[PDB]
Design a binder for this molecule. Structure first.
Ligand SMILES: NC(=O)c1ccc[n+]([C@@H]2O[C@H](COP(=O)([O-])OP(=O)(O)OC[C@H]3O[C@@H](n4cnc5c(N)ncnc54)[C@H](O)[C@@H]3O)[C@@H](O)[C@H]2O)c1
Ligand SMILES: OC[C@@H](O)[C@@H](O)[C@H](O)[C@H](O)CO
Length: 492
């Protein structure tokens, strides 16, 4: 049965449906970057709220800034913007549900002015973001905005025909301001420590490139709440689409698969209101930092620790790494010895229990999360997920070898051949550049570790870290992943 408004009431009985009248909803959120995570997290909670009969004026208008986004728009439009959220997990606590909280989706390429007009509409009160970990154009080492990027210079030169996220937000804010319409909140839903502060730094820096007056008005009228967001969401696959049809009878052109667990912790800093998400499990706090350091350092950090070694070993799913005891032991040693000592207490959460739940969640066999997905964009992920932990170990004079192995694994992985002799390409926005850094084994540590916007300055200047990196890399190249882990694990 094709999913659409006509067949909504004709689906299998186990399929959960929106409880609200789809036609009564109105838009309040414009979301930039309509991918799997947005649909399985923000759209999911917004749909849940609407099912309680509240927040019907907070429907989401998706926004696609890239040509690849046309396919999402077409697929959703062909189903009256409905899509299936398909939970997969090793227990029965999984549900299949049709989500109705996204009511439209605009593509910048169809008309920049139509998109600016949507973003400047008074009913749109929050502009949310999933533009990836490296989408903010802020150098972690020195905190500066990359003003010299081509697309950034283009937007400064043609402010009414922007291409970038900051260009569209600025154009919309100036148009609202000219019409006497209040600003919206900009709500980052990407995985970065202090993601709201980063969003603010970037937008303000870009605004200052226009003038101080605009930079100052945005600083005083727009809020940028920080948040921790969590829900494992694999890439779309034909197998999952066929499984949804086989098991629940729905023909969905683009369902979103995700794990049952979901979490959202947010600072309540909204200038123009927000849905009452707290009624459906979203947690507001006065300080999200402990939550963000906990989740990014342990979950996202462990994902990088497993993914490159896993890919080299020939594994292709996260659960496969979890079926290898050496990988589980390595992950636990990384979490227990390297990350945990750096964490401040997190209200309402026991870290020992939490670490165990990460092992359980990564061990989900039914979800089939692709190592290609977790591996992707390491150039942007390392400074967010792993380097902060390494810097602390270096400053403390603590053992860096487990953390260095993650970087050594990435370096060998960049050569593009796994242990089964299979050649693969690198899904990274800076693939060519990174691959060139590892072309000469004799110069790898000197060249790879010297990229400041990825590794910072403590790493290349630490003889202890450099030594750990070099021996890990040599060991992986010569003895392979398994033996390297065996040796590392028999280490106090
Ligand atoms: N996938 C997960 O399990 C998960 C979990 C937590 C947080 N996230 C966060 O959300 C992001 C998206 O993951 P996903 O699963 O939706 O991925 P996806 O590949 O399904 O979609 C990524 C979306 O971001 C857009 N995008 C990419 N670069 C952009 C840029 N520079 N400017 C504007 N839009 C851009 C894409 O066009 C697309 O809309 C992550 O990068 C991360 O920060 C993902
Ligand atoms: O909530 C878990 C997500 O942050 C995680 O699946 C990331 O998308 C992953 O670590 C990216 O490599």
């Amino acid at each position: 049965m094709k999913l659409n408004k006509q067949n909504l009431t004709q689906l299998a009985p186990e399929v959960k449906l929106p409880a609200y009248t789809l036609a009564d909803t109105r838009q309040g959120i414009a979301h930039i970057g309509v991918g799997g995570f947005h649909r399985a997290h923000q759209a999911y909670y917004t749909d849940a709220l609407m099912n309680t009969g509240e927040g019907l004026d907070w429907s989401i208008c998706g926004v696609g800034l890239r040509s690849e986004d046309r396919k999402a728009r077409d697929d959703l439009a062909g189903q009256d913007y409905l899509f299936t959220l398909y939970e997969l997990g090793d227990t029965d606590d999984t549900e299949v549900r049709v989500i109705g909280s996204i009511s439209d989706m605009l593509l910048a390429e169809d008309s920049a002015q139509a998109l600016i007009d949507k973003l400047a509409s008074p009913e749109i009160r929050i502009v949310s973001l999933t533009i990836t970990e490296g989408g903010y154009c802020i150098d972690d080492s020195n905190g500066e905005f990359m003003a010299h990027l081509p697309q950034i210079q283009h937007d400064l030169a043609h402010p009414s025909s922007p291409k970038t996220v900051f260009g569209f937000i600025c154009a919309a804010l100036t148009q609202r301001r000219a019409a006497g319409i209040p600003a919206f909140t900009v709500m980052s839903c990407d995985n970065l420590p202090h993601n709201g502060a980063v969003t603010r730094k970037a937008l303000l820096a870009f605004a200052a490139l226009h003038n101080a007056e605009l930079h100052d008005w945005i600083k005083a009228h727009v809020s940028f709440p920080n948040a921790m967001v969590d829900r494992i969401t694999p890439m779309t696959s034909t197998a999952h689409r066929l499984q949804l049809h086989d098991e629940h009878g729905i023909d969905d052109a683009w369902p979103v698969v995700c794990e049952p667990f979901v979490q959202w912790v947010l600072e309540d800093k909204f200038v123009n209101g927000r849905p009452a998400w707290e009624k459906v499990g979203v947690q507001f706090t006065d300080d999200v930092t402990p939550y963000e350091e906990m989740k990014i350092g342990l979950l996202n950090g462990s994902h990088l620790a497993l993914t490159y070694l896993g890919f080299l070993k020939g594994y292709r799913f996260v659960h496969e790494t979890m079926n290898d005891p050496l990988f589980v032991a390595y992950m636990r040693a990384y979490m227990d010895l390297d990350v945990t000592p750096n964490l401040a207490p997190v209200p309402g959460i026991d870290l020992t229990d939490y670490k165990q739940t990460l092992v359980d969640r990564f061990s989900n066999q039914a979800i089939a999360d692709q190592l290609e997905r977790v591996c992707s964009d390491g150039s942007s992920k390392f400074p967010k997920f792993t380097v902060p932990t390494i810097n602390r170990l270096i400053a403390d004079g603590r053992e860096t070898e487990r953390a260095a192995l993650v970087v050594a694994a990435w370096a060998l992985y960049l050569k593009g051949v796994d242990e089964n002799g299979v050649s693969y390409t690198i899904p990274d926005p800076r693939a060519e550049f990174c691959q060139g850094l590892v072309s000469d084994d004799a110069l790898i540590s000197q060249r790879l570790l010297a990229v400041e916007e990825i590794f910072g300055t403590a790493i290349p200047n630490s003889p202890e870290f450099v030594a750990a990196f070099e021996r890990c890399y040599g060991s992986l190249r010569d003895n392979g992943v398994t033996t390297t882990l065996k040796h590392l694990l028999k280490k106090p």
